[PDB]
């Protein structure tokens, strides 16, 4: 039993047609008591074919949108105008709750895959979408108002309102496109916009923290991007404050997560993650990851302010190397000098050769 | 079933005599799961006859006090002095938890009606009042201390303490009056102290936001005041972040609230509100309101920071008018030009003639 | 039934050997609904004999550490070094979650007693400790990683890793020692570092508030230290915002706590606290305390920002003395002048002679 592992098939389909799909991960606390810290957050996946449009809608939740694959055009509609953004792979943006938006895949050949992280507040753990369009699955929300309210509001006869706004035009909310100051800070940012925080011949990790990004600061979230070569190992380490929701994007990751529970109580959670699989890494739990193939993953860290990552192996940022000999001698079965010598054997930091010996 | 509607008779009487009453609305989450966002808030109503006093007491909760009808004298007692405020109709003030206060109706002819919004923190969803006076319903809290503690504290014999402080003087906590720097920011503010944000021949809305008021900023609350002429319609719109607790003060309001639930799932909640009735308008839910008579209402918006109200009809702030023709053509059954022409039929903004046609 | 009283024997033993013990108080909300405000907090007690070491570990929770008796050396390990602090009696320090630390009792004769207040966020109401050492009760968390992960991480054969780091060296996590800029603000602070806020011939109270201390500001906690002579009474008073967790350190305290509940509803909770006993004083509840012996207590106030303590007896800060005669006459059975005269009988403030008369 691994209560931290969310396979790709634990996403429920909200909508699917020939043009794309929207899927919603089960609540983090559906099957476990151990993830109450995550009860206000939901994960969605949006996939769309080339030359498609997701129709205008607003969400009741704040959304952090990330392009995992492809390219998008995002339009955010405000009461007095609209903002249009091109999103390339690795671009993220916050969409404030209550902003009507639509999404286009402008590519002629490549699918679009987007991760949406929902931060709920209206009804904690619930995310709702309000589509202007009537479709087979639901009438327009405008159609729920009475005839008298609609005729008065639009100063128009009901039959004109029904024929122009309310009747079903599209089968579904993903459609094919027709065939032949504060502006700067609210803009998309790329996960690889800055130098990687860890980088060697085996792997790289990029990280954007709330301390360095105003959209993330509002949400208390960090975003990271992991790139590893086949055979590389991201050595045992833990996060002091962030709980990381780790999403497999490309490749296969062999994760080992070490936990302490209340039912003594030391547990190895081990899983190989394929594309779309998620594992939650609680703060203070040691974790390591071996690349079974060339891989790319994205991490969404909640409770992110003042997070510090502590390493247990390798040369740099290894907390065990900072214990003085007289105390390491009492802590470990080796002598102080033997512990010190063992911890100096690994000349690499962060990512190492994971080949068996 | 309308889980958002709280009729005036869902207030329970905490105290009533010939001089006035104090009533407490049932918990927002008593009968529904849909209002967990409101579980820390309670609504009270205080009504008193001319020339009456509500006896000194402190609350365990923060209170936002609003005069709906009449005039009051409010006295706030601190350890080193007291502050005295005159409150006229529409005046609001925050009373910090643990401040002993009393309230007078100084008018010789007009009742006093006050709305108290309680923000609980000691015992989430519970509000308690500690009265110094012994009355039929409860002894003074001072009387719960032992004789030895009282005699030592007051350096006085128990019989003097009992005769001067503890014995019952009044039947109840509402009594008749005897017949013949930081001071500036902590002061009462009127809901109509600034120009209305929306104003035409049909209606006005005044709004005070936490961005513009230091007492509201502490609570993350906005306060609004709605005035409409009989026959006027406040057209379909939604709030991006605020959940508004709408209180009918004067007149009859025909509300249409449009919701999305999880048991597809589009619902019209329609009710005519008379004086004292409440309806909760969740953020992102479209809402409209027709005046069945000249009316006045007060709205208490929780989660208020950075709220934006999006209109769905009328000329100004209409988000549907900001969708470009090529996308409105795909969104709606009308052509782009037909949608644009329909949305330009209503020349008014915010409030319109609601007469049936 | 006193749901606010936590006797010393409601601490469960997490670990005990001949060198010391670590104990964990039951959850505040285990046996009552009345302390939901405290569900994220846990109280621990650490006791150790002379010349002992608590082995290196990190916690998943923030810890506020206070020395109740004796002296300690605290070492905080960071990824790039370590900080060493001497803690004397009354010294407090915040240990951020995820910081590996160890604790020494360097005294040759005196036990060390520490109070740890845990502020949980990973799993609300749960605190976990990750020890590097394998002991009888649990293997090292490093031992939960696979052989292949360990050999690759440490670039060393498993047998060397097992013999140097993983095999059991110590029976338990408390061992005997071998026999023959931001640095300033992160440092320990003493509860008696400033003048006492209340001080007379009967008692003293020291208090450190989040407004005056950056470590406490992060946690929204105040810390107080009470010293009273046998026979002294800390007169009836209440806190406007803070809920105080009162810990008996030395001596016997006769507490009277006055509460209002929902099952009219006035209750005296009276108990004599001996060393190690705790009582929770909810905000707005009147409280008084008589010293049955010379005593010292420590109070941990949660929800501490802008707390104000209101006195009900004595000369200074007595809110009842600030009610004008015309209203005290209506509030109390005595005349306005009789109330005023009674409240002036006690010439002392805060602490008074508690001798029976």
Swiss-Prot record, chains A, B, C:
One of its GO terms (molecular function) is identical protein binding. Keywords: Seed storage protein, Signal, Storage protein. Gene3D superfamilies: Jelly Rolls (2.60.120.10). InterPro entries: Cupin_1, RmlC-like_jellyroll, RmlC_Cupin_sf, Seed_Storage-Functional. One of its GO terms (cellular component) is protein-containing complex. The keyword Repeat does not apply. Residues 4-162, 189-340 form the Cupin type-1 domain. Belongs to the 7S seed storage protein family. Seed storage protein. Homotrimer. This is Canavalin. It comes from Canavalia ensiformis (Jack bean).
């Amino acid at each position: 039993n691994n209560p931290y592992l969310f396979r790709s098939n634990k996403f429920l389909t909200l909508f699917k047609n020939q043009h794309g799909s929207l899927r919603l991960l089960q609540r983090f606390n559906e099957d476990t008591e151990k993830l109450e810290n995550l009860r206000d957050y939901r994960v969605l996946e949006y996939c769309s074919k080339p030359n498609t449009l997701l129709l205008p809608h607003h969400s009741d939740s704040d959304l952090l949108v990330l392009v995992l694959e492809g390219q998008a055009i995002l339009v955010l509609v405000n009461p007095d105008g609209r903002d249009t953004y091109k999103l390339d792979q690795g671009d993220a943006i916050k969409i404030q709750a209550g902003t009507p938006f639509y999404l286009i895949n402008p590519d002629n050949n490549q699918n679009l895959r987007i991760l949406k992280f929902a931060i709920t507040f209206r009804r904690p753990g619930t995310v709702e979408d309000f589509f202007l369009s009537s479709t087979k699955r639901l009438p327009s929300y405008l159609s729920a108002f009475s005839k008298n309210f609609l005729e008065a509001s639009y100063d128009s006869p009901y039959d004109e309102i029904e024929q122009t706004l309310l009747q079903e035009e599209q089968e579904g909310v993903i459609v094919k496109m027709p065939k032949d100051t504060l502006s700067s800070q609210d803009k998309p940012f790329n996960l690889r916009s800055r130098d990687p925080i860890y980088s060697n011949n085996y792997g790289k990790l990029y990280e954007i923290t709330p301390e360095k990004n105003s959209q993330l600061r509002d949400l208390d979230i960090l975003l990271n991007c992991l790139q590893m070569n086949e055979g590389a190992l991201f050595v045992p380490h833990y996060n002091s404050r962030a709980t990381v929701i780790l999403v497999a994007n490309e490749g296969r990751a062999e994760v080992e997560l070490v936990g302490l529970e209340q039912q003594m109580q030391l547990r190895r959670y081990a899983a190989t993650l394929s594309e779309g699989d998620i594992i939650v890494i609680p703060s203070s739990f040691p974790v390591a990851l071996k690349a079974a193939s060339d891989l790319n993953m994205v991490g969404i860290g909640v409770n992110a302010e003042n997070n510090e990552r502590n390493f247990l192996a390798g040369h740099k940022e290894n907390v065990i190397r900072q214990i003085p000999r007289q105390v390491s001698d009492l802590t470990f079965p080796g002598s102080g000098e033997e512990v010190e010598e063992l911890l100096e054997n690994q000349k690499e930091s962060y990512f190492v050769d994971g080949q068996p010996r």
